[PDB]
Curated annotation (Swiss-Prot):
Official protein name in the record: Peptide deformylase
Originating organism: Streptococcus pneumoniae serotype 4 (strain ATCC BAA-334 / TIGR4)
Matches recorded under CDD domains: Pep_deformylase (cd00487)
Catalysis performed (reactions): N-terminal N-formyl-L-methionyl-[peptide] + H2O = N-terminal L-methionyl-[peptide] + formate
Cofactor note: Binds 1 Fe(2+) ion.
Gene name of the encoded protein: def
Amino acid sequence: MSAIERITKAAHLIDMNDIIREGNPTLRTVAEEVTFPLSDQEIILGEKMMQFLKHSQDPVMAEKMGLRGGVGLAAPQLDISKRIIAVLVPNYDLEAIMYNPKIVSHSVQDAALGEGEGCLSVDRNVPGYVVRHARVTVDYFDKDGEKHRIKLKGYNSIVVQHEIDHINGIMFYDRINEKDPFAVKDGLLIL
Ligand SMILES: [Fe+3]
């Protein structure tokens, strides 16, 4: 059966085995927008994704399930090519399951996490500053089809852009400067 059918079973607990890794084509394909109303499966998927982030952040649960801590997850990482992402940033400073998220405005200023970025789908390290917009205005729909328009900055902005990149088939290392990975370009804010 399809990944979505499998993952949305009531009994299913997403774990690292459901997360596809580099090389799997799905991570480089642009995800299909979801239509409204959402199917029960699409709603359940978003919930399963958020439960996974919560489990990955619980020391006891993370150890038992063999999970890597994460603050974001995109459906393509589960081999589901739908524009659905989940973000969970503990202070939670940000908690959202977003359907068809889209950046509708961004700052001229860029930003990058000082400590760089990792990815549950990447088993290895690619050091460097992952250059992103410092600030973004994001439109997304929640499970009931209601539209939300939020403004993000700092770490939250980074996390959300990172997940939106997945639904567009972009990986974090694609935004690190090949030549000099730690170059601090003009207008780049290091967090
Ligand atoms: Fe990722």
